[PDB]
Design a protein around this ligand. Structure first.
Ligand SMILES: Nc1ncnc2c1ncn2[C@@H]1O[C@H](CO)[C@@H](O)[C@H]1O
Ligand SMILES: Nc1ncnc2c1ncn2[C@@H]1O[C@H](CO)[C@@H](O)[C@H]1O
Ligand SMILES: Nc1ncnc2c1ncn2[C@@H]1O[C@H](CO)[C@@H](O)[C@H]1O
Ligand SMILES: Nc1ncnc2c1ncn2[C@@H]1O[C@H](CO)[C@@H](O)[C@H]1O
Ligand SMILES: [Mg+2]
Ligand SMILES: [Mg+2]
Ligand SMILES: [Mg+2]
Ligand SMILES: [Mg+2]
Lengths: 211, 211, 211, 211
């Protein structure tokens, strides 16, 4: 802004598509048909949980004027031990997790959240997504360090073959280790802005995955 | 061009809508319910006929290196006396013309095409759109003169209350005389480029009207 | 109907628009130019606040297998006295409220939330949207009793001239009293499902208003 | 189902994407980097030429109440010896042909149009798309006999490695011989209806290829 009051449009613009490799959960499942159980991984924030409520509360509580809350151990303790009660599970994640359970895959969560003394996020995820004990693995809190992709080594260590995530670093962590990185759309009401350019590495992007 | 190989997208962009007053034929009909017969008008090119085939042929035949064909009387003779055999009627126009016939409206066509000694466009339109004799009026060839909207005076003269068209000058001709100007989308494969910004005057734009 | 693995698409579908009266905040502002200060009203949930985090926590806490939480005063006491710390303010609301405050309009909030003994929602709204105390009015907790219109009487009582809301009942409540009902899009990750058909009464719908 | 006067919409629908493998010409070019000159093939109608003007004239002239014109040699003689002067070349085809000529690829056209005693279509294509005589090959008129695949044998004969087309049979013809079938969108104002479901076999579809 400012911008024209009545900008109008045209049918070239209305029909215009970005060249993105869109996929569905069913297409992913089909692409894996006949493949034995393997390790797969999920990002948490804006991938399986709309957790902006806790991040928003955290900023207001711990650093209303800056971004310091993200490096505040007190914030992470709150975030990892109860504030996910307000996090809303994503339907795309329900469908993916169900599919990987059907396959007998081992399911990992690899998050940029900082590790804390205790955490109840693993419980929240297993409960909300109805993940059986055998498929479930305790959440890996990889942390966040500018200049380093903290997730890549975890994907290698756990032999993760597919990694789902909303951020560029989720996709490149997969690329770093030769895994299949698949993009989930970050919701437009997320407080984590700007939204990433889903498909910017030529990766598969799941349709309708903002909710 | 050039532009990024993998530009990606995000869900804000995917869901983004231009602020346009979109309408359907049914909504227009409803808005006129109970109103007695009146005069209404249609633009021809890219409004009721995809006539690019004749314009394309005309440019190649009469001015392959310039835009002079548009002021060439020989071109207009060909265009108005047979080349509309290759023009493709628009479905939106079939629906609008049917609706105005239901209403008992007088139907006019007001085109920027130049007048010629003879014309068979009136026949083409009445035949293709199944317009009864009573509703049909001979095409008004208003011509094109830079700096002047040649259509406005015709809308006034014929007491035209609604004017349908694809070009900015169709909408402003209606505005000039206090008529209701309603926009039809120009097809993206039209040779008349650039496409106009439908809705740029805050006018109603008919959905799906490119075909 | 079969839902194919590879459904494909076509350019008619890609370009297809629903016939909706889309508007922008700037267009609304323009439509009010020169009009003196008036009373305007807002729905709360999915109109100005993404409050699904608290409603989600409420469902899980108070009625995991039913909708009984929505009639449980213990839930409402939590929801109205602190759980909005986890609600995410909507950008469309920031823009509308700023615009109306700039106009000198009186700002009302009329919600279907159940009334409670105390409420901190009024403070949350005034603080987050930077609403001066003069323009601000205490939230009107109209309640929600299906088969009953509980907002219209309040719109009439406060002479509210424009009412913004996401639900069908918000629009018809406005229409029933002769107010201008303007629709805001409910986010697709709201837990209040199904999503309403914005524009279902021919009302104005604000573009990009899901966030 | 009732088709409401005011159907409305919701943001799930607004953001909804079909799971299609969209590609750009630049991405196709990138995928071929370093690969030596090869034979590539194009369908004609609605792939490189918007030829509906002639097919429309043909239907009206030769079989206004049936599809018999499509099997009438008198129609084909007209269609293949001058009516393409009214066909509108597609921009997507200009870009693809330029790209393949730049690569040093051999260019073939394999059409389901019926063969005629003479044809000027090869010249029309070479002239309009600026195809050097070396890269150019005379159009292969494979014909169209429903229940029969008439293009696959030609793709094999000419060792065509990539085949571009708008119809389902174009894609499956390519797949049947192990060639890369790439879909172009049929324009919504084509008279060949219904429009195909581009992407219905999981094939690549070129973005914005309706014009
Ligand atoms: N502005 C922001 N709002 C909300 N969450 C953020 C923001 N920046 C980073 N995060 C999230 O918090 C963690 C630490 O930066 C990351 O894993 C990231 O997903
Ligand atoms: N570049 C163009 N291609 C096709 N038709 C055109 C072009 N410019 C103008 N026209 C049409 O030809 C007429 C004379 O300019 C106008 O009524 C207009 O609709
Ligand atoms: N599942 C839900 N999620 C969020 N808000 C709801 C839900 N059901 C009802 N509401 C809102 O709460 C109020 C009381 O039910 C209503 O006015 C409605 O707008
Ligand atoms: N109605 C039509 N309009 C345009 N092209 C058609 C139509 N029907 C068939 N064709 C094309 O002409 C050929 C012979 O029918 C086919 O290969 C097909 O692609
Ligand atoms: Mg994330
Ligand atoms: Mg026109
Ligand atoms: Mg609401
Ligand atoms: Mg074809």
């Amino acid at each position: 802004s400012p911008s024209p009051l009545n900008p109008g449009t045209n049918v070239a613009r209305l029909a215009e598509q970005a060249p993105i490799h869109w996929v569905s959960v069913a297409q992913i499942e089909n692409s894996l048909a006949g493949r034995p159980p393997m390790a797969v991984g999920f990002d948490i924030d804006d991938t399986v949980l709309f957790s902006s409520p806790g991040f928003w509360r955290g900023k207001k509580t711990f650093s209303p004027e800056s971004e310091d809350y993200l490096k505040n151990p007190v914030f992470w303790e709150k975030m990892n031990n109860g504030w996910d009660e307000f996090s809303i599970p994503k339907e795309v994640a329900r469908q993916l997790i169900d599919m990987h359970v059907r396959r007998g895959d081992a399911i990992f969560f690899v998050t940029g959240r900082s590790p804390t003394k205790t955490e109840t996020v693993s419980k929240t995820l297993a409960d909300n997504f109805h993940i059986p004990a055998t498929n479930m693995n305790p959440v890996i809190f990889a942390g966040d360090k500018p200049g380093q992709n903290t997730k890549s080594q975890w994907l290698q260590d756990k032999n993760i073959r597919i990694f789902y995530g909303d951020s560029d670093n989720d996709i490149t962590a997969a690329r770093d280790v030769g895994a299949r990185g698949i993009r989930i759309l970050r919701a437009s009401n997320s407080t984590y802005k700007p939204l990433p350019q889903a498909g910017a590495f030529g990766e598969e992007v799941i349709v309708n995955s903002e909710y």
